[PDB]
Write a protein that binds this ligand. Sequence first.
Ligand code: OYF
Ligand code: OYF
Ligand code: CL
Lengths: 302, 306
Amino acid sequence: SGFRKMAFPSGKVEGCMVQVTCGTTTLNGLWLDDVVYCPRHVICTSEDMLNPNYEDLLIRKSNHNFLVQAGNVQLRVIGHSMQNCVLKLKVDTANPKTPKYKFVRIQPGQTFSVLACYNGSPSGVYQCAMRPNFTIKGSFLNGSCGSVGFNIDYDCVSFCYMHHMELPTGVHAGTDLEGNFYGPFVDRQTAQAAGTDTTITVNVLAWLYAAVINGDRWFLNRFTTTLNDFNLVAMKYNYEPLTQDHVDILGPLSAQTGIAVLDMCASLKELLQNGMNGRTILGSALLEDEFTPFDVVRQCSG
Amino acid sequence: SGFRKMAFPSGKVEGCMVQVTCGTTTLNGLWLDDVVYCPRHVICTSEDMLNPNYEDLLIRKSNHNFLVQAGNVQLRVIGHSMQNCVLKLKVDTANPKTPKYKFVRIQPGQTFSVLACYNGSPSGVYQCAMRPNFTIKGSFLNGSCGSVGFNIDYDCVSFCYMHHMELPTGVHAGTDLEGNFYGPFVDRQTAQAAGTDTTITVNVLAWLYAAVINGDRWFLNRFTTTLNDFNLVAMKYNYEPLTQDHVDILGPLSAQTGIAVLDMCASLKELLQNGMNGRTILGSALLEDEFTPFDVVRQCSGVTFQ
Ligand SMILES: O=C(Nc1cncc2cnccc12)[C@@H]1CCOc2ccc(Cl)cc21
Ligand SMILES: O=C(Nc1cncc2cnccc12)[C@@H]1CCOc2ccc(Cl)cc21
Ligand SMILES: [Cl-]
């Protein structure tokens, strides 16, 4: 019993965190095999950040301009290349702690663990979701760039995010491990803003199924809804549209609890209309949207 | 910017998790130096749990009755003894991944990270607090016994909790690593219940300071209060009493934000008496009490653990 915002154990990723320094700038790098991945803005000074020409800034650097520190050991950079917004530094030592890993680009609504780091040293681990507006609501201070997001389903680390920047609203933007930004963001100091965010409907439904699995049914009602009528209502509360894919994905949770997906949608419609009336659901007075259907099944009893 | 429920990096503890099997029961053990610590109830059948005589149940076991698996390697148990509600299995190999560690008993209100494990394999990490009623609001399924709670202070892992049981309300009970239970609980299948809980006042104040640091100020007001008047309101709302020690501990956050501790107490008093009026604080509609003043300072300063 219980339901917590649970992160993956971070040890496999801690053994990959290194410090990358280029001139006066220091940030984090991810050391996998003989390559260290980090945000390409490590080659920029604060001045270069409005309209950096990364190809021009990079051509001026030699391997010895990159200082990579792994614990108390300096690694030797023997090559460098840029892939999109990530810089890849080839080093002369393969990381002996390299776990089984893959690079995966995720979709909005997907969750992942973030290992926040400073100076190549891990500070904390927390669970995040890629918001519908392609930002993440992280907890990052100056020096956290290059911290990564990941999942560890079945012993393989799937790296899905590398931290690059904080937007004016205090939310965060980054890339996948191939250096492609999530969303319409650029690694430039030019005026950029997070778009209007919405609630991840499929995740709220998954979390209502988690509440039913954990013994809470107060919010259920005798009604059902069509998928279209649900979407017309939910969008009035700034909820993402629920697709037939989301309905299919919720099938296993629907079968386990005996509550049809559109019946749970009717419950959600009623919660949006009524609020909680002084009650809580899984210790929350708000509808939680940072648990996916997969997270609920993984955490909850069967 | 941002403020998340953040756990310590778990790698140092992951390297200590092992699987302990005794007969039909499998649970988790903590392998530090040449000893594996686990709940003593690993030796009980379901019927033994009804009224166990642990000394008597243990005298019937030999070292070979305890199968300890560290990853894909079977460790050899060469001794066994009980300390309170923990069983200590001496093994023939010191854990090469043993971090610098201590065993510490925490007080209610203190937070810690839990590394939830099943079959000696870490599954997740989360943060929680020792409630004033000595339970933890954990997330644990069957097989999670022996999962541990810890803090990291500098390069030292302070182990403070070992999971033993789930109470009927779905909250959890366990011991320190010396096998002493937190709370008036016993390791027996008998009627037990979590007592009425209270809110950890000093932690709510710390989280209000975290909200101010992160740019949320709507709850601030021009008022102040005395510690006695604030404590009268705390008692009324099932909040733990705030001591002068708690005020002193909140001193740094008070100096940073410019909001005196008793000034923040008047904001909390108003929140208790009036509610949030449709507003949220750090994305929450409830007053959060599972961040200590130290957690707030640590998260807002970026302290690392290499
Ligand atoms: O966002 C950035 N720094 C940080 C990241 N995350 C959290 C933080 C918190 N507080 C200050 C700084 C932070 C850098 C510096 C600002 O301007 C830019 C512009 C583009 C890029 Cl790609 C990075 C940055
Ligand atoms: O609580 C216990 N098991 C678990 C712990 N945590 C979470 C769980 C979730 N779901 C089922 C079981 C769980 C065991 C089994 C029940 O009877 C007792 C009685 C005393 C003692 Cl010390 C332990 C136990
Ligand atoms: Cl995805």
